[PDB]
Amino acid sequence: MEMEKEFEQIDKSGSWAAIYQDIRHEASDFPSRVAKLPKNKNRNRYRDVSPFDHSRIKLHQEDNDYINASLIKMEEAQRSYILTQGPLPNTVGHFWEMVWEQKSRGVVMLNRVMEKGSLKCAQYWPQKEEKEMIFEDTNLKLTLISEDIKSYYTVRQLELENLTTQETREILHFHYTTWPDFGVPESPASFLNFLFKVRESGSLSPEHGPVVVHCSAGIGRSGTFCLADTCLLLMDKRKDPSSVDIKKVLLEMRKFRMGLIQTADQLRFSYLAVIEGAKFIMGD
Template sequence: MEQTGAAIVKMDQEFEDRDSGGRWQKLFLEIRNQSHECSYKVAKYPENRNRNRYRDVNPFDHSRVKLENTENDYINASLVKLENTENDYINASLVEMEEAQRTYILTQGPLKNTCGHFWLMIWEQKTKAVVMLNRVIEKGSEKCAQYWPTAEEREMAFRDTGFLVALLSEDTKSYYTTRILELQNLNTGEKRQIYHFHYTTWPDFGVPESPASFLNFLFKVRESGALGVDHGPTVVHCSAGIGRSGTFSLVDTCLVLIDKRKDPSSVDIKSILLKMRKYRMGLIQTSDQLRFSYMAVFEGAKFIMGDSSVQNQWRELSKEDQEPSSGSPPSTQPQARCPPERCNGSQRGAQPDEGREYRQDGKVPAQSSCKEQELDGSTTQKRRREDSISKSSTNKATQSKSRLNDSERKRKRTKTSDC
């Protein structure tokens, strides 16, 4: 016990030293410079452009999730299983932390035209829980389509992929909402219950009000059992699937490892983040998010190492039973709706700055092979700029679906090696 106490004190001291020395930005830049970026050719194919919320946030080829039961199965997520589909893209990435026995699918907030694919991915990967860390509308910009039914409508059908989503229950706290959804495969009639954990007060590019509220939320997710090995990977998303989603996954993984090793000082947060960045680019977008991650890990370690009173303190400090503020519940404004039965049809979500050919670092084409990553700082600025552009251009968005010619259909998808 003395050893544990000493380790906690050491962690606190290291945190204070970084704070007093203003060294968080330096650490953040070190992580960015030591990160490596793998190829993401598939994300840049013309037929997949309207499936990416942001031009500069793409799943790596080696870790992207592949949809199995659709003619065009791309989604911005990472996990690879199938080989012979015509187009298997979705903007999502499988992050697999072997020692912690944790697997997450980190993905962007679904677009109007990818909601059906989002639910298809959840079905195929046998996911038990979705962790949503953003609101539908933030600062006037759409961050995510409304892909689940509200209390008023109760259910949504996605005929393009053959799923029906029904709302079974909804429990709203001051800063998060827990839903139980029923996902039905319309082709087979099979039904599954899915947890939907929705953190409603985490600002984009920012951090939660306190580690207490965040940790209370994280342990609510853990208590469901959905993060365990008995279920498929938990789907975690925010808007781009890298900042808030990266923070959630990093803190959870570090706390699992502290629990396994029984030695907080043996868990190198920086190394774990660098490993996670091999699966999805740019995880943790700002030095503030990095600082918050360390703070949450150190605070969570106190509970894991035997201080059971800490969890009650989190609950009290988070004030979860207070009435939500007027700005807390997720907005469901019409422009962010995912139209039932048309999610993957000809309609296309507004894409920021459509006409500009994007290059990741301004010099090297996005389709290049592994190279040092230079995403974070420039990406933050580009995403903010694109959000601004998107506000003015939403009503002008192209609503035509990309058509593949014969040569594009036959183009060989080259599998890249892991980095």
């Protein structure tokens, strides 16, 4: 079926939970043996969220190459994403090592450091220009260059230096600051505006490594971001945009990381975002 009328048909029939449970039943199951090794317990935020072995990102290190991060490679859309958990106190150096080694331009953050009164990720970037961060375990230096605070999101320019080689690179940090503690946003307008700002920066383009996107577990809000981006790109590429099937795209992405889209409310929100976004693209 088309999307916008499939949408009204699920709303009127109140069957979002059943649609979402079907997706959960059909999703891929692949091994995640490296994630479960005892030496990696303090590298995982949640025991039930792990990268598959076949798609996990490897650190260029001979001691322990493990990070909780997955490569999502979308062949028809010609887009790739790295989805990862919010960094932990003992993985902030690994996180920036990955950014460096994978040649990423941008980092997309969809959570606040504290939500619901608890810490959802480490403070992994510097908050003042004159107070830089040094990660001694991976030999990197990170400096805040500029910060632009808007009503729904903040963009930061960061400088990452590999202290072994003295090479430097500019990284863009895109921080969506207004996702509610409970539920999903009422309108997708600010989330779509944010997606378009990431696109306009070059961070999603083939001349760079894959964008790094995270929330707390790296599967819920993060899944919503890449699902909406990929669906909108397919609608622009194909002769028949109404052939884009959001449930089929989601099952393809779940071949590369488990659990993408965590609730039936997130599924409904993803439909809403793609529907509204397809009107703004046109040709309108």
